[PDB]
């Protein structure tokens, strides 16, 4: 549970926002890319697993599940790559709701930055710091409890 993350890909301004959500906390990291390829998804997972103890990733679609580049980065970083099937259906709606929330945040900061990637990082910041404890607090508590 502390090591489980979900990939999610959403579209804005003709670009792709790739998101990794730490399932137990709601904590996110995200990046803007021109389009979702295995190459970009593999690089993004390497960055994520170098920063947090990523044990399991539920991939966002069958192309990234299949991708031999994604499989190679999962092997390299010690990550169990799984499918993203919402066997519990509440998962479908939870990701949908996060994409809407994120885009709503993005629209609240959009005029403060020239480039989409900056507005996405401001949104990552606002999402992780929002008290609901924040997601950022929750992930650190979860993983610290796991270490002890």
Ligand X SMILES: O=C(O)c1c(/C=C2\c3ccccc3C[C@H]2O)ccc2c1OCO2
Partner touching 69 among a copy of itself, ligand X, none, CB below 5 to 8 Å by kind? ligand X
Q: How far apart are CA 140 and CA 54, in angstroms?
A: 13
Piece of 11-19, 50-58, 69-77, 137-145 that binds ligand X (CB under 6 A): 69-77
Partner touching 51 among ligand X, a copy of itself, none, CB below 5 to 8 Å by kind? a copy of itself
Helix (H, G, I), strand (E, B), or coil: what is residue 131? strand
Piece of 15-23, 84-92, 110-118, 130-138 that binds ligand X (CB under 6 A): 110-118
Q: Can residue 35 be called a binding residue for ligand X (CB under 6 A)?
A: no
Of 35, 66, 72, 85, the one binding ligand X (CB under 6 A) is 72
Contact 60, 7 (CB under 8 A): yes
Q: How far apart are CA 7 and CA 20, in angstroms?
A: 5
Instruction: Give strand ranges (E) for the chain.
Output: 4-12, 15-22, 27-33, 56-58, 80-82
Residues in contact with a copy of itself by the rule CB under 8 A: 29, 43, 46-47, 49-53, 76-77, 112, 117-118, 121-122, 124-125, 128-129, 136-137, 140-141, 143-145, 147-148
Rg (Cα) of the chain, in Å, rounded? 15
């Amino acid at each position: 549970s502390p090591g489980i993350w979900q990939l999610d890909c959403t579209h804005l301004e003709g670009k792709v926002i790739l998101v990794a959500v730490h399932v137990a906390s709601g904590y996110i990291e995200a990046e803007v890319i021109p389009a979702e390829t295995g190459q970009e998804t593999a690089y993004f997972l390497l960055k994520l697993a170098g920063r947090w103890p990523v044990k399991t990733v539920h991939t966002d679609n069958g192309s990234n599940f299949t991708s031999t580049t994604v499989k190679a980065a999962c092997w390299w970083a010690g990550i169990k790559q799984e499918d993203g099937i919402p066997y519990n259906p509440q998962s479908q709606g939870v990701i949908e709701s996060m994409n809407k929330e994120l885009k709503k945040i993005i629209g609240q900061v959009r005029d403060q930055a020239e480039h989409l990637k900056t507005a996405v990082q401001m949104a990552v910041f606002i999402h992780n710091h929002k008290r609901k404890y924040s997601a950022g607090e929750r992930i650190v508590d979860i993983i610290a409890t796991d270490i002890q």
